[PDB]
Design a protein around this nucleic acid. Structure first.
Ligand SMILES: NC[C@@H]1O[C@H](O[C@H]2[C@@H](O)[C@H](O[C@@H]3[C@@H](O)[C@H](N)C[C@H](N)[C@H]3O[C@H]3O[C@H](CO)[C@@H](O)[C@H](O)[C@H]3N)O[C@@H]2CO)[C@H](N)[C@@H](O)[C@@H]1O
Ligand SMILES: [Mg+2]
Ligand SMILES: [Mg+2]
Ligand SMILES: [Mg+2]
Ligand SMILES: [Mg+2]
Ligand SMILES: [Mg+2]
Ligand SMILES: [Mg+2]
Ligand SMILES: [Mg+2]
Ligand SMILES: [Mg+2]
Ligand SMILES: [Mg+2]
Ligand SMILES: [Mg+2]
Ligand SMILES: [Mg+2]
Ligand SMILES: [Mg+2]
Ligand SMILES: [Mg+2]
Ligand SMILES: [Mg+2]
Ligand SMILES: [Mg+2]
Ligand SMILES: [Mg+2]
Ligand SMILES: [Mg+2]
Ligand SMILES: [Mg+2]
Ligand SMILES: [Mg+2]
Ligand SMILES: [Mg+2]
Ligand SMILES: [Mg+2]
Ligand SMILES: [Mg+2]
Ligand SMILES: [Mg+2]
Ligand SMILES: [Mg+2]
Ligand SMILES: [Mg+2]
Ligand SMILES: [Mg+2]
Ligand SMILES: [Mg+2]
Ligand SMILES: [Mg+2]
Ligand SMILES: [Mg+2]
Ligand SMILES: [Mg+2]
Ligand SMILES: [Mg+2]
Ligand SMILES: [Mg+2]
Ligand SMILES: [Mg+2]
Ligand SMILES: [Mg+2]
Ligand SMILES: [Mg+2]
Ligand SMILES: [Mg+2]
Ligand SMILES: [Mg+2]
Ligand SMILES: [Mg+2]
Ligand SMILES: [Mg+2]
Lengths: 271, 46
RNA sequence: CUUUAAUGUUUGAUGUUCUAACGUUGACCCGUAAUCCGGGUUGCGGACAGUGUCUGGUGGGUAGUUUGACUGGGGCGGUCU
RNA sequence: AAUUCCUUGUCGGGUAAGUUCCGACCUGCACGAAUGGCGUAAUGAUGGCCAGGCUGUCUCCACCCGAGACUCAGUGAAAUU
RNA sequence: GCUCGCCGGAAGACCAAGGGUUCCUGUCCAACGUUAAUCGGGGCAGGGUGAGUCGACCCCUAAGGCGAGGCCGAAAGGCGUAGUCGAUGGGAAACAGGUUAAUAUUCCUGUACUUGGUGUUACUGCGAAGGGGGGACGGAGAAGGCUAUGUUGGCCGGGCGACGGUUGUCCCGGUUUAAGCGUGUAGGCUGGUUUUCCAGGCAAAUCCGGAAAAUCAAGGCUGAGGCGUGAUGACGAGGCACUACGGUGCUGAAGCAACAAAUGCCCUGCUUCCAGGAAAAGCCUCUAAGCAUCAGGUAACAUCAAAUCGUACCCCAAACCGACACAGGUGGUCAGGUAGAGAAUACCAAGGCGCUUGAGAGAACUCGGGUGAAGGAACUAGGCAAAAUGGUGCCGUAACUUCGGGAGAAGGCACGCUGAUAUGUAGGUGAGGUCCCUCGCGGAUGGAGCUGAAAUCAGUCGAAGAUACCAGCUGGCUGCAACUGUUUAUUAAAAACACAGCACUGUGCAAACACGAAAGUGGACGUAUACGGUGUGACGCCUGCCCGGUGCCGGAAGGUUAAUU
RNA sequence: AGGACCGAACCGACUAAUGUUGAAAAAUUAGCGGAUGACUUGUGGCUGGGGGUGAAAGGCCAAUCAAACCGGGAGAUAGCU
RNA sequence: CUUACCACUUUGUGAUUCAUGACUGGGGUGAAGUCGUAACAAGGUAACCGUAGGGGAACCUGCGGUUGGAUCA
C-alpha cells in the first residue's frame, strides 16, 4: 500500500511511503551478493563525470539473472525480496534442480507459484520464453535486446512491452517509452508486468530522502557566476539567454540521438 | 585556530619520499636535480 | 551520318539482394583454475556503420585582440576634410 | 508594495505630537501569473511597527570592590626621524 | 615544613599522532628562562628504556595504487588481465603481587596460556590455487539479569578528645585479592537422527542444496555474571626497630553481610523499521590429482622453538601544529563523595597546581564588576548594552490550523523544617522455615532483615525556603522565505543557495551526456515508474492573450550552394 | 516514529564589549544556533591550474586565488615615476 | 492573640452583547439620463433547472434533464 504520513513533524507531513509487507523481512540469500562500492559519479581519474551523485546508504548488489536459461527445469518462488540496485522487486525461486536464483518478480508473483522457461515453457507470467514462441500482443516483460544477450528492456518497475507484431525472424514490439522498436525475435522475454507499479507514488518528503538515497543536490545555472556556467550573470536574476546545458546546448531542442547503426531496428520514434 | 600543518610520517613519506620520488619520470629528475646541486638530504630520508 | 527507338555494351542516379572485407559492449572453445587481450567456431549486422584526406554549415565551448582624438575634469552632446 | 519619481500622495487607526507602522483609495513615473500571481498554519540568532515587565539607556550621575594607570627596584621594546 | 587559596568529566591518569633523550643522577649559571636565580624542558657529563603472550613485522584483504603479456598513444606516457601491494578493519597466547633514581601484562614470586616441529601411545582415510559453511557486519528502540562501585551495618585496629559535653549506642581508618581451571546459570537461538533417491554447487564429494519416507522429540549450540580452586599465599591499617633524612629493614589485626546503581557486560542478543545494511584469510567440513602395510589425520602427554624491531619521556601540552616556556588548535580511554534529572553546576577525594617580575600607593582616566533616592526608554538610527525571566507538580490557556499544532501560549497556586499517619508507609529487595520434585546456580510457599518516595494533617523559624550555582521574558500588528539545512575560512547567515513537489526536454542502451587525442571509464553491473539537462521551488486557488523577431521541432517541392569531375 | 522538543559533550558562529605595536596574522568574556542527523569525528585514499572542487560566494584549492606555488623563456615591455 | 468561611475590592485572560469606523459588497426606493433588447408569439438561436466557463450588460456557450414548447416539423 501507499500510506501517507501524519504531519507529526515538518519534512514528514508530506512523506508518502510504499509498503509491500509481503516482502522478506530477514537478510538476503548471501551466496548471491557481492560488494558494490560507491563511485560518486567519479571517473577513473577521480574527475566527476556525472554530477549530483554520492552519499546514500551502503547498497549491496544482488544477482538477478536477466538471462533466464535453466530451461525445462521448473521452480517455485521461495520468497519475495526487496532490491536496492533496482526499482522492481527481486524474487527468489529455487529450481527443482536444487539451485536458487533471483528474478525481478512480475505482477502475479504470489509466493509459492511455479515458473519455467524454454521453447515449450508455458505462456504465463514468470515463465521466460523466446518471443519466437510466445503469442502476439502479449504483455511480455523483461525483453532481450540481442539473442541471448541478457535482456535489457522493460526492467524497471511497472514497465512492460507489447508485441505489436512479427515479420519473419524479427518481431516488432512497443517499448514503454512509446517507440516502435524491432528485435531478433529469438530473444527470451518472459511474461507479465514487472512488480510494484505503485513505485511511482513515493513522495519522500524531506530532502534527506533523496540525499541518503544516494543523490546530491543540484545547482541551477542562473544561480552561479558566468565563469562557472553559461547561465551565469547576476545583478538581479536576469537571463536573456537560450536554455543550454553547462556546455552550450539547447536543453529544450536538439536531440543528440546520433546512432545510425540502430535506426534499422526502429519504426516509429518515441512520441 | 587550526594551523596548516598536520604531520603524519606515513603520509609525509609516500608523498615526497625517495620511493614515490623514484616512481615518476620527472620524479627521478627532481632528485638528480638536487643530486647535481649537491643537496644534503635528497628527500626526507628518515 | 544527322531527329529519333529495341540489342549488346559502358557509366552515373537511386532501390533491392548477397557475402567476402569491416563491426559486434551476442554465444561458445582454446591460450588459462582470466572479467582485459589474442586466435578459432557460430549467430547478428554488412559494404552500411566507422576512420583518414579534402569540404559546406554550425561553433563565446575556447583563444588572440580591437573597441580613436578634441573635450575649460571625463562622460553626454558636438566636432575632425 | 523589498516595485511610487512628485512623496511625509490622501483618508482612517495608534500618539500629547507618527517622513516609520497598520487598514484603505488607485493618479500602477516603472505589479502581474513557473527569470511564476495571490494567499498560507508551522518554522526563523531574518526586515519593520507596538506593548507589558524591566531596568544607570537616559534625566544626572554618586558611592563601592578589583586589573592597569602613579612611586621604587630588575629586565627592557616600537612607529617615526 | 606549617598554613592559605585554585582545578578536580578536570588545570587529574594513561595512550595514539607528532616530538626525538626533553627521562634519571650529579654537576655548572656565561648565553637561554621577558626579573633574581643556588633552580629548569639551559650547558657538560655519565646512567636509563630487558617481552613466545602488549604492539610492528607477520597471514587476510577495503579504498586505492602498481602491473608480466596485453590494448592504446608523435616521444614521454595513458589504461588495465593475471597477479602484487595497501589499514583506518578480520586471524593465537599472561594475569596478580614486588622491585629501580629512572624499565615493567618485558626484570623477580606465584599461578597460567597459545602455536609449530620431533618423540611415545591409542584411534583413523589422508589429500587442494578447488566446492560448501563460517567468519560476516544497518538504524532506532524496549526491557530484564549481572558486574563495576557506592552506602550502611558487622568485624578488626585505634580513639576518650587544647572550650561546655563525649566509654558504651560514641569519633578515625580498613575491610582488597587477578588470569587461568571446574561448574554452564539469567537468558538467546534452533527440533534432532537413520536410510534412500538427484537435471544443482564448472570435476568430484560422504560436505551443501533438493525429495522421500522412518523414527524419536526433552535433543544440540550459545552465553553475562555467581559459586568453588587459585589463595593456610599476597596485600593489608598499624607497630617495632634504622636513616644519608629522599628514604630503610622485620612484623602484621580484621578482611564478612545487606541494599543500591551504569552510558559497562549478557547483547555480533531481542523488538521493530526502511534508506536494506565491507571484503578476504584464520577456522570447520567435502572431495580432486596423488598416495595407497606408506604418508598423513585426530587426541593425550614429553620435549625443543617462538626470531626480529618498538618499549625512556611529553602527549588538551613549556617536549605535537601555531616564529615565543604564546589565554588558540589536537583524536581515544578512565569516571569517586554530597547535592542534582545529569559527563550542567557548587563544594570536595585520589591526583595536580598558584599560571618565572615583585614592593607600595589608593589620582584623572581606561578595563571587569557590586549597589543606587525619584522617574522609567524621556536614551538612541535602533531598548545597543544592561536589568529582567528562569525549577517540579497542579489549576488553567486565544485568534488561527495543514487538526500535528499554535502551547511551557497567557495568567496563577504550592514548595523549608519538625512530629504523626507508619517507632519507616506504598513500593523495591528476598533469609531461615516448610513442601515436593525432572531434578540443583531446581521449583514452590514463606515474607526476617535491608532499603525506601510521594501525599495529608498539625506544629515552627526567617523579610524571604525553585533561598546559592544553575535556570524561557511575554504578547500583538506586519514584509520576506514553506519548513531541518547551506553559504562569502579572516567585516555579508539573509529576503541568498538548497530542498521535498512541479513542468519542459533529451535519452532504446555500445543510451543521452561527461572525462580521455586514444584505449578505456563514469552514467550503471541501472535500462523510460530509469538516467541526464534546465527553470520553478511545500501546500491551497491558479498559472491569461501574443509564434511577428531569436532559438528549437517537423517539411524540403523549388531557388542558391563546397570539395569534386 | 520523528532532517520532532529542552539541554551538556560535540559541531557552529547571530550580538555586544575588549583587544587593534593583541595572550592571538580572527581570539577572550557574557549572551547565541544545531545537537539521531543533508549529524559529527579519527585514519588512509582519488580529483592539479584555464584545471580541480564548489547545497554557488568567484567561494576553497597549504595564512596566497577573476586562474595556486616553484623554476625557466627573462635584463618580458614600461612614449611613465 | 490566632485559624477557617466570606463582603468590598484587585489582576490576568476568554465568552457574549450593543454602539461605532477610513473604505467597501451587494439589496430597497426614488415623472422624464446613457447602453443595448434577454424574456413574454417559434420573442425572431424555444424557454427554464442544475452545473461549468466566458463577457460592458442583459447574457452567450458546453453537459445532462424538464415541458411549465410554437407547426401538419
Ligand atoms: N431597485 C430595483 C433593483 O435594481 C434594478 O432597478 C434599478 C435600475 O435598473 C433602474 O434605473 C432606471 C434605468 O434602468 C433606465 N434606463 C432609466 C431610468 N430613469 C432609471 O430609473 C432610476 O433613476 C431615475 C433618475 O432620473 C429615478 O427617477 C428612478 O426612480 C430610478 N428607478 O431603477 C432601479 C433603481 O431603483 C433592477 N433592474 C431591478 O430588477 C432590481 O429589483
Ligand atoms: Mg551569486
Ligand atoms: Mg560563458
Ligand atoms: Mg557578485
Ligand atoms: Mg574571449
Ligand atoms: Mg600578444
Ligand atoms: Mg499599506
Ligand atoms: Mg505564462
Ligand atoms: Mg514610541
Ligand atoms: Mg623601573
Ligand atoms: Mg639535550
Ligand atoms: Mg628533569
Ligand atoms: Mg638538562
Ligand atoms: Mg595502471
Ligand atoms: Mg598482502
Ligand atoms: Mg589496523
Ligand atoms: Mg572539655
Ligand atoms: Mg613508558
Ligand atoms: Mg615513568
Ligand atoms: Mg610562563
Ligand atoms: Mg534608581
Ligand atoms: Mg524615543
Ligand atoms: Mg540586548
Ligand atoms: Mg544580565
Ligand atoms: Mg512594508
Ligand atoms: Mg529559510
Ligand atoms: Mg536555520
Ligand atoms: Mg565574513
Ligand atoms: Mg557572520
Ligand atoms: Mg527562485
Ligand atoms: Mg518564489
Ligand atoms: Mg532536532
Ligand atoms: Mg562563547
Ligand atoms: Mg538543542
Ligand atoms: Mg583527510
Ligand atoms: Mg587560503
Ligand atoms: Mg627573450
Ligand atoms: Mg626589468
Ligand atoms: Mg430577443
Ligand atoms: Mg441544453
Amino acid at each position: 500500500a501507499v500510506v501517507k504520513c501524519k504531519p507529526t513533524s515538518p519534512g514528514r507531513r508530506h512523506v508518502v511511503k510504499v509498503v509491500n509487507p509481503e516482502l522478506h523481512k530477514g537478510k538476503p540469500f548471501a551466496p548471491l551478493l557481492e560488494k558494490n562500492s560507491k563511485s560518486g559519479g567519479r571517473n577513473n581519474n577521480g574527475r566527476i563525470t556525472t554530477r549530483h551523485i554520492g552519499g546514500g546508504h551502503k547498497q549491496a548488489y544482488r544477482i538477478v539473472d536477466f538471462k533466464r536459461n535453466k530451461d525445462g527445469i521448473p521452480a517455485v518462488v521461495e520468497r519475495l525480496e526487496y532490491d536496492p540496485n533496482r526499482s522492481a522487486n527481486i524474487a527468489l525461486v529455487l529450481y527443482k534442480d536444487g539451485e536458487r536464483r533471483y528474478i525481478l518478480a512480475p505482477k502475479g508473483l504470489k509466493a509459492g507459484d511455479q515458473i519455467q522457461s524454454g521453447v515449450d515453457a508455458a505462456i504465463k507470467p514468470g515463465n521466460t520464453l523466446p518471443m519466437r514462441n510466445i503469442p502476439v500482443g502479449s504483455t511480455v516483460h523483461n525483453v532481450e535486446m540481442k539473442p541471448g544477450k541478457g535482456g535489457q528492456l522493460a526492467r524497471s518497475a511497472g514497465t512492460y512491452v507489447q508485441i505489436v507484431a512479427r515479420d519473419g525472424a524479427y518481431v516488432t514490439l512497443r517499448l514503454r517509452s512509446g517507440e516502435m522498436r524491432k528485435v531478433e525475435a529469438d530473444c527470451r522475454a518472459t511474461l507479465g508486468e514487472v512488480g510494484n507499479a505503485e513505485h511511482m507514488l513515493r513522495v519522500l518528503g524531506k530532502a534527506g530522502a533523496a540525499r541518503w538515497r544516494g543523490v546530491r543536490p543540484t545547482v541551477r545555472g542562473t544561480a552561479m557566476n558566468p565563469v562557472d556556467h553559461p547561465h551565469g550573470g547576476g545583478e538581479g536574476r536576469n537571463f536573456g539567454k537560450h536554455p543550454v546545458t553547462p556546455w552550450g546546448v539547447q536543453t529544450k531542442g536538439k536531440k543528440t540521438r546520433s546512432n545510425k547503426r540502430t535506426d534499422k531496428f526502429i519504426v516509429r520514434r518515441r512520441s | 585556530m587550526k594551523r596548516t600543518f598536520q604531520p603524519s610520517v606515513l603520509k609525509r613519506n609516500r608523498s615526497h619520499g625517495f620511493r614515490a620520488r623514484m616512481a615518476t619520470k620527472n620524479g627521478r629528475q627532481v632528485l638528480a636535480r638536487r643530486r647535481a646541486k649537491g643537496r644534503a638530504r635528497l628527500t626526507v630520508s628518515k
